[PDB]
Symmetry: C3
Subunit: 334 residues, 3 copies
């Protein structure tokens, strides 16, 4: 029975970090308790000062990543404070029944609820807010994240050999649909409700105005680049709740990749570009071998460089001339 089974409480951390946790483990199943608080807020999303009337789980885009093990039970308390204006709920793609939990978590401002479901399938799974009649608006406005359910004995390769990561990072990619006025400038709205009609009309064209990692253009560059060092293995979790994307690590590879995101399937090796289907999360492992700066981006280069879907990873260590060597620097042509 899930009733008896020890309970545990997890504290969440802001993306792109993922909360400390175990890969392989000797512990038996548990009821893992989490809490999240919805926050509607206006956010600045680019270098020219454009804003989005946004909606978030826990104040961030994307929401925090939740980690449990196969066979555990997830038990979430979802809170919607009186300071918000809309109702919300939650749908876990990793769960079975009731539209992922949406039908049992409908919360008006000033209310809360508690849902439990069994995490009986391994992989990275999207969760979203899906209120009847406003599903796409809430999702494109920022209300998505990932639940990672790891196998009890850790990750495995196609032959059943063990795989591991030394660090984990989580990246949410958001296609945004910001309206413009007759002067061709983007519109700035006083409340969340007033942005609605105009936004639906942009959505229907299927052309995003911006496509961003973790809330804004440049969120993962400069002081905020991801970091690693030569010899370390990183797990890159990538979610896209509404639209397809194609991650690529410029200067590196996907060593082992589950593009559909489900760990009971064998991963593919040596990828240059992988593919995340809209409405899913995927995962890639890579072991660094050269120091320097890498670009982790959506490899439709217009979507990356013009629209915003690109970040940086800064890697420390020693250069490997066997792997790569500048034989003759740029010089005049004889």
């Amino acid at each position: 029975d899930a009733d008896k089974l020890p309970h545990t409480k997890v504290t969440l951390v802001a993306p792109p970090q993922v909360h400390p946790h175990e890969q392989a483990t000797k512990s038996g199943p548990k009821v893992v308790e989490f809490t999240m608080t919805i926050e509607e807020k206006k956010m600045v999303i680019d270098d020219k000062g454009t804003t989005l009337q946004a909606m978030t789980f826990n104040g961030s885009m994307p929401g925090p990543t939740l980690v449990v093990h196969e066979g555990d039970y997830v038990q979430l308390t979802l809170v919607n404070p009186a300071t918000n204006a809309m109702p919300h709920n939650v749908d876990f793609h990793g769960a079975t029944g009731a539209l992922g939990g949406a039908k049992l978590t409908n919360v008006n401002p000033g209310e809360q609820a508690t849902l439990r479901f069994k995490a009986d399938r391994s992989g990275t799974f999207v969760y979203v807010c899906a209120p009847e009649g406003m599903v796409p608006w809430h999702v494109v406005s920022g209300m998505s994240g990932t639940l990672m359910v790891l196998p009890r004995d850790g990750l495995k390769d196609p032959q059943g050999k063990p795989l591991h990561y030394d660090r984990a990072y989580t990246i949410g990619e958001f296609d945004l649909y910001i309206p413009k006025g007759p002067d061709g400038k983007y519109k700035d709205y006083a409340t969340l409700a007033e942005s609605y009609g105009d936004t639906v009309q942009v959505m229907r064209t299927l052309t995003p105005s911006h496509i961003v990692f973790n809330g804004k253009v440049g969120a993962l560059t400069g002081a905020n680049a991801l970091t690693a060092k030569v010899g370390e293995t990183v797990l890159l979790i990538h979610s896209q709740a509404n639209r397809d994307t194609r991650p690529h690590l410029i200067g590196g590879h996907g060593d082992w990749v589950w593009e559909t995101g489900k760990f009971a399937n064998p991963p593919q090796r040596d990828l240059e570009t992988w593919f995340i289907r809209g409405g899913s999360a995927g995962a890639a492992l890579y072991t660094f071998k050269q120091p320097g700066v890498y670009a982790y981006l959506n490899h439709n280069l217009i979507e990356a460089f013009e629209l915003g879907a690109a970040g940086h990873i800064k890697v420390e260590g020693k250069w490997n001339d066997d792997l790569m060597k500048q034989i003759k620097a740029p010089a005049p042509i004889p």
Copy 2:
């Protein structure tokens, strides 16, 4: 020789049903005979009354699904009645040679033809009408369906263990390109020929006006939802002859999925979202475990909720609190 081999005659049924048939079987190869009649017709495709100058195999979008077994021969009589205005033909992606049969089935109104080909490869395969110089118009106007070629010993999992379905359903997804007039309202045309030029211009923008399952917005909801019960396995066949889509069962999963649609390959398990490439059909199995209402949709949520790509499945039975439990209903925040 295919000449000698018993012949059999199959009677087709309207989507979303699939005609009775056997999975595993002791019968040897046969020549399976089918007939289809082309029907051009104006159809209502949404809740505001918009119409499409449509073209169909057998009066439906999509055409009926044809089922045979690996090693059988398909023998189709294609009829184009004098009441139609355009010529047509057929291209089976499951066949080898002559552009899938198009070059041997060109039929003007008042004519018919008969084609035979060997179904030597297992999977779900699209068929379409492809007349020289008008290929995309006929396809986007409704002329596509699926041929399912099952392995003689039935479906198998990656380890070679047997899989089965208790029911089958077939869903065709159609990206439509309906023109608008200077007043911004959709155009209504007196004949099929007059819709042509305007439609080509919308097509070239790559933005559909509507995206629908089985002919229209809401075709698979309300009195027309699909049905199942807890403990039953369903096979969901999904075709898209022109554009990519990403099926997802909200509240459930793809237990075993062949996203490229070819049964000699091992399927993937536990998927949240799968991917059907434009110009192919794919297949997913799922065993229900909770009763209620599920949404089966394209998980670009704008394409699903705003443009039309979504249906419903109504499932009867007993609720499972181990799988999912509402711990604390929505209530005021302490």
Copy 3:
């Protein structure tokens, strides 16, 4: 050490051909030397006379395909003649470090450089020109190609049995973004620099004006169709450096396909349509069984027939009535 190891010099040939080479081989690793010269040029890209201010590796779109074996070292001399106006560089997705080599190959007009990297992973990999601040423009203007790294013992099927091709062909697919003037006609530019601003604005809409194989509408049809004969196996290499595409051989199949393009993974069999992610190259094998004309195209049929993404293959030999037979030619309906 890579220093000692015999060197060899390869001479490149224009697409769609691939330079003679060995599949399985008894030779040990080598340092394989290549040279490429960048050429900016105005090109005619359609049947109405539209031009593109283009940028190429070696005068062609796509660039030539380079072939080495796993464990070899690639050593490229990249030359940028004084007659060009822009700087350029190179990023090999098959390489490790320094943004694929871009950071060590920045060459202004009148300069050259030489890069070496170890090809330690099997598959077809895209290479591109990626200058800081102008990455998407150079790529969409024509600066991409494929490096094929074959396994030392040749290609293998999922069970480890040997596979081979008798011929190879290489196809690059280019999404183009040509601006229009107030009269709705496409613009013709005097220099490469003057096309820039207008092109960026079209790019940002994500709607290509044209989508072409190997530089232009019809590049692979008529006198320029690909060729084969019944009983022969062909390898079709397909690259798309910026946008997703879905190859399909009308009248045939993908017998064995590596859609992500990495040969250490098992291929899928019997495909009708496969999928090349933007920023990657993929590969398919097919053995012809019927003579005639086939269409090799992108199976979004609008992108193929209206925008340009389609070619032809002309196959000689004897017709097979077991595989396909016209039973009753088109005739009046009784």
